[PDB]
Design an enzyme around this catalytic site. Structure first.
Site, mmCIF file in Angstrom:
data_model
loop_
_atom_site.group_PDB
_atom_site.id
_atom_site.type_symbol
_atom_site.label_atom_id
_atom_site.label_comp_id
_atom_site.label_asym_id
_atom_site.label_seq_id
_atom_site.Cartn_x
_atom_site.Cartn_y
_atom_site.Cartn_z
ATOM 1 N N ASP A 167 -138.565 -23.732 -21.413
ATOM 2 C CA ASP A 167 -139.262 -24.615 -20.473
ATOM 3 C C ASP A 167 -138.298 -25.502 -19.700
ATOM 4 O O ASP A 167 -138.095 -25.318 -18.504
ATOM 5 C CB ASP A 167 -140.281 -25.481 -21.236
ATOM 6 N N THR A 168 -137.713 -26.469 -20.391
ATOM 7 C CA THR A 168 -136.762 -27.378 -19.776
ATOM 8 C C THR A 168 -135.380 -27.063 -20.330
ATOM 9 O O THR A 168 -134.398 -27.733 -20.017
ATOM 10 C CB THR A 168 -137.104 -28.834 -20.110
ATOM 11 N N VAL B 254 -140.419 -19.569 -25.731
ATOM 12 C CA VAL B 254 -140.272 -19.853 -24.310
ATOM 13 C C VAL B 254 -139.235 -20.908 -23.938
ATOM 14 O O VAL B 254 -139.007 -21.868 -24.683
ATOM 15 C CB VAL B 254 -141.619 -20.269 -23.709
ATOM 16 N N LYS C 86 -139.397 -19.913 -18.010
ATOM 17 C CA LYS C 86 -140.035 -20.518 -16.849
ATOM 18 C C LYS C 86 -138.989 -20.835 -15.797
ATOM 19 O O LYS C 86 -137.935 -21.385 -16.131
ATOM 20 C CB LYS C 86 -140.741 -21.824 -17.246
ATOM 21 N N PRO D 47 -150.918 -15.933 -28.673
ATOM 22 C CA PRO D 47 -151.889 -15.441 -29.649
ATOM 23 C C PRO D 47 -152.019 -16.245 -30.941
ATOM 24 O O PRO D 47 -153.127 -16.601 -31.342
ATOM 25 C CB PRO D 47 -151.442 -13.991 -29.887
#
Ligand SMILES: Nc1nc2c(ncn2[C@@H]2O[C@H](COP(=O)(O)O)[C@@H](O)[C@H]2O)c(=O)[nH]1
Ligand SMILES: Nc1nc2c(ncn2[C@@H]2O[C@H](COP(=O)(O)O)[C@@H](O)[C@H]2O)c(=O)[nH]1
Lengths: 201, 201
Positions: free
Chosen positions: A98-99, A96, A143, A176
């Site tokens: 994020d920032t 992912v 995100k 998961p």
């Protein structure tokens, strides 16, 4: 308010993303941590084309400290591995965004490795462009929020150099392979619509 | 006649195996290929104990050729990683034990690294045996058929040194991260009783 992700979901995300990625025509994958390794490995199964040898995946660990400080906790020994980033298309994988901090430096450090390998070979990226290395990024989730660092414009923009399986609202995602009760985790995920979305064949 | 394995199954296998493994008290995990990485990564989530830093996972690729020939396709750069195998308990991970060939050499080569890293360190495992390196193995599946290689007997005997989640029959197992249709793969697995075997909480 957590977002539960099932293994099978992560699998389908890779699946759909597999196609767009097929353009970039990656020569190798460099995975950030174990987080990026799992999807990277799955991602491979889909990029396999008859006859053509299976693409290689290189795992790397990157530690970022403050008081920015980078630390190559585990890196690619280009030497003994006999890996040449020159004129290749590298795809950076991690679960992912994020920032963006992580990928920022991940790209950065890897770029240094390329340009310094190019010198070592006697090449001049300026005089002879084509010899340059083309970097790509792949994340299951990206995100949407204010990123505290950034990736080069031309790439971040081109829909064939930066792939986000899905772009999603600022929340916390539980993957998961992080759960200590997959059964619960799964039930939850299915209840939030985070399971499959591409019926069988 | 294939045996379909679900992600969630692989997850629970690691889970139960996590306990027995907790004895060996591993200092680090070395994963063979991506195959061993996925379960290794999961395995980690379960070995996490409050406060204690999370165990490290080192990925390695090993190529075996014939006409035996070993080839370190991707190895651990102990140097830059600052990893000392001396007096540590290493756990080797890989998804399945078929002919044992792979683990045979995987163990072998890694043992050489320990020895040579031990001598050049100014120590001798004879007079000071509290320094030698203790190796452990972990596989989701261990097929029962006549093997082609072999690991040291004291290790393949002490049930706290060789860990195999489920000890299965000689068949071909399809792992979740290999399938190009997880949905089918899953349905199949559930129908063969290869899905979860432990409920929520
Ligand atoms: N499980 C989980 N990890 C996250 C989440 N957001 C960030 N992380 C972790 O934090 C790292 C930091 O990413 P960055 O903020 O530097 O872009 C990620 O690579 C990942 O390991 C999230 O929603 N769920
Ligand atoms: N998917 C799958 N791979 C297998 C199976 N049996 C062996 N392999 C693959 O073959 C390698 C050879 O293991 P060895 O026979 O040397 O002990 C394994 O690490 C694994 O990558 C099986 O039943 N299913």
């Amino acid at each position: 308010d957590k977002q539960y992700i099932s293994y099978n979901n992560v699998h389908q995300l890779c699946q759909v993303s597999a196609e767009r990625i097929k353009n970039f025509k990656p020569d190798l994958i460099i995975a950030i941590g174990g987080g990026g390794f799992i999807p990277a490995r799955i991602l491979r199964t889909f990029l396999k084309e008859p006859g053509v040898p299976t693409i290689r995946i290189f795992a790397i660990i990157l530690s970022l400290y403050e008081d920015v400080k980078v630390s190559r906790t585990q890196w690619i020994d280009y030497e003994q591995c006999k890996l040449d980033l020159v004129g290749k298309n590298v795809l950076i994988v991690d679960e992912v965004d994020d920032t963006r901090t992580t990928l920022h430096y991940a790209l950065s450090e890897l770029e240094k490795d390329a340009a310094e390998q190019a010198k070592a070979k006697g090449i001049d990226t300026e005089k002879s462009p084509e010899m340059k290395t083309n970097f790509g990024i792949f994340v299951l989730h990206d995100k949407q929020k204010p990123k505290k660092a950034d990736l080069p414009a031309e790439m971040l923009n081109d829909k064939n150099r930066y792939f986000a399986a899905k772009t999603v609202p600022d929340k916390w995602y539980a993957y998961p392979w992080e759960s200590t009760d997959i059964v619960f985790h799964t039930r939850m995920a299915i209840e939030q619509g985070n399971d499959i979305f591409i019926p069988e064949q």
